Each structure stands twice: as C-alpha cells, then as structure tokens.
Amino acid sequence: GDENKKRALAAALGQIERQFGKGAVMRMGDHERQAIPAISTGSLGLDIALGIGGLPKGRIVEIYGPESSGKTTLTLSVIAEAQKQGATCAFVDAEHALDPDYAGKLGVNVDDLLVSQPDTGEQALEITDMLVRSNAVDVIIVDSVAALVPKAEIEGEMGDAHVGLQARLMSQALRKITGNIKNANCLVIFINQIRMKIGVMFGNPETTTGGNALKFYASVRLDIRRTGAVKEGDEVVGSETRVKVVKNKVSPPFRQAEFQILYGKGIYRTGEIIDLGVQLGLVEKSGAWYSYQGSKIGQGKANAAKYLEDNPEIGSVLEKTIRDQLLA
C-alpha cells in the first residue's frame, strides 16, 4: 500500500530527473536561506519597509510615480549600493534621459556601468534578455516602460490605429524574461509612469502605463511621490519623498516609508537613521534637543547629521542596531 505509493512516486521522480534534469523537486536542506538575498536600496525607510532589507534578488521590481517624483534617482542609488557590494549593473533607458555626471555625483561608479539607449522598444527588451542570459550583469534597470515604442509603431505614421500594441510586447517580454531571472539571480527594475485613465467616475484615477501584464510578475511594486521640498530660506536643495510599497511578495505590503532626497548628495540616509533612532529610543531628544547617551549631540537635524558624520562608526552602530531590532 503506502510502500507501493512511495515506490511509484520514487520511480516517477527518478524518471523526471533522468529526462529533464535535477529539476523535479528542490533539494530540501540545500534551499534554506535565512533571508532572501536582497539588494539594499540606499535608504533605511525602504530596507525596513520591504522586510528583507532591500529589493529581492531574482524578481522583477516596478517603481512608478508622477513626474519629477524620484524614480531615476532611487534606481541610481540602488545601482550604487549594488556596485559597492561588488556586482556588475546595467542601466538600459528608453527616454534617452540620463546625466552621467549627476549619476556619478550620486555615487554610481559610472566608469563601470553598461548603459544602453535602444532606438526601439523591442530592442530594449532584447538587450535586457541577452544581459540576463549572460549571467554576468547582476542588476538591470529598464527606464520608462512607457517609452518602449514598438517597432511597428515607429515604422508607421503619427495617428495610425495601434491600440494595445505595446501591452502585447510588454506581456510577451515578461513571459520570456521572468524564467531566466530566477536562474540568473538578477534584479530587473521597471520604471513606469502614472497616466490617469478615463471614466473612473470616482476614486483614485491614477493608472500605470505599459499595459497590466507587468503588475502580475512584479515581485514588489513601489509608488514613489514627492510631498514637499527642503528650503534653506530661499533656495531648494532637496525634495521630501514618500515611497509606498503597494504590492509585495516577500513581506506584508503597504509599509509606507519616507525620506529626503538631496540634490547631488543623493539620499539623505544620515537623517533617516536619526529619525528612526529617536522614536525607537536609542537617541533621546527632550522635545527639541537632540541627545545621545546623555550627551547633547547638538541643536538641529543638520547638527545631528554632522555629529554623526564626524564619527562614522557611531552611525554604523545605530544603523546595525535599528536593523537588528526592526528588520529582523
């Protein structure tokens, strides 16, 4: 009986292994990773929000947001974080908009960055597929999913009836890419654009572009928006952002995170660590006086940031402790 069932199951598994390979049942003990391998996204707000301390590796990721929200800068911060770890990263853009000087200002080692600017949508997807299959590039960022114009649309003239042409291309490209990514342990990030739909008649009318075949494969979809702006009396040097994890498959969704983006200097992690530590308790402020270990670190966020910058180990200790208390 049960022995007969076990024998039949063993025979079937052996035959599957013999015909296809070692891909019928994953090895039990082998596939036990304490955490899914994640690429830090340059900010504690997102690392804590995601739960796995960074975007999951081997899965499509999708960040969209209104104009000048902070998508490209976030992707560049992710690329710089990956490069500091020691993995090759490739940036493929469609709107042909990228200031490599500014990218290098953020921290990305532009000297080693495979930037492709395809003239057509199908070509961009082909380039991403080739890079993924190469198993060499570790992080892939495809910019402006809305800018992947199909070859047919370019060949035709302005005003022709090409309804739904790009959604087919997007769905097909994902159907082919999703399989290779997991094997290659890559991390593909798509940058959509918000394009309000018609006839909503009530409620949230925002609607992501590039068809809706991308929101099924996307392992984690963000929603990055710009709330205010940081002004030194007269000039603006940075903009506050608010990233909301609208979808997720590695931790509970809707873990909104907030942080500032400083032009040139990139993400302002030093202020975010202070904010988290103050509410956790590791940093004490008597209302409006920042303190730490019974010492008046000074007066002001900029002052606290300078006090932490003078001592990098002090910052790293707080960042390790906060992660160990919240992320895990």
């Binding site: 006839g199 008649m201 009530f202 409620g203």
Partner: protein, 124 residues
C-alpha cells in the same frame, strides 16, 4: 450593420455578454450620435418614455455620463438602462415608471461603469 450584441434590462440589472445575436441592415450613421450597436431591451421600466419590451435599442459607446440623459449603466456584471443622475458619492438611476423604484448606487462602495448613451429604438 449594427449587429445586436446582447440585451439590456429595463429594470433590475441582468447579465450581459458581447455575443452577436444577429446583424441588422440599417446604415451605421442613421442615428445622430452614430449608434454602433443595438442592444435588445427587456422589461417595462422605460414604458413612460416610449421604450416598451422587446424593442431593439441603439447605443453609442460613451464613457462619460451627463445628468438627465438615458444611459446604459453596468453594475458589476449586470447592465441596465436608466436615467443618469449623480450628485457626489451617490448616483441615482431614475426609472420612468412608478412601479420601478429608482436605484441608488454609491460610487465609493460599488464601482459603476457606463456602457453608453441611448440614441433611439427600433421596435421591429
């Protein structure tokens, strides 16, 4: 042409599918708004307006609704014909019959989609 692609309910909403029943022979632009398809009616909700039961109704594909004009609402998988009247988070689907009590639909709680506006009736 104007192939008939289903039937609308004049009253309680009923399921509606896109399957073509038959093809009529009236020119597409016979109606002012250029009706695209005829939707068979079913009921007596609009008897007061001249739309009795079993009378092919022409519909124009429009996603926007204006108060006071008869439209083809589509609640969930159900489609019905009523006068459109919206004053905020609530929408009233008035019926031209004392028997049929108006329908209240709250946009916040339940999604409402408008199939289009009626442009005439055939009554063949």
């Amino acid at each position: 042409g104007l192939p008939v692609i289903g039937r609308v309910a004049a009253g309680a909403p009923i399921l509606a599918e896109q399957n073509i029943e038959e093809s009529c022979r009236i020119n597409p632009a016979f109606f002012n708004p250029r009706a695209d398809y005829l939707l068979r009616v079913r009921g007596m909700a609009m008897k007061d307006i001249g739309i009795l039961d079993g009378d092919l109704l022409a519909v124009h594909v429009t996603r926007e609704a204006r108060n006071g004009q008869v439209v083809v609402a589509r609640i969930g998988e159900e489609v019905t014909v009523k006068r459109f009247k919206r004053e905020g988070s609530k929408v009233w689907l008035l019926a031209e019959n004392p028997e049929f009590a108006p329908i209240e639909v709250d946009l916040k709680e339940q999604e409402l989609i408008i199939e289009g506006l009626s442009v005439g009736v055939i009554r063949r």
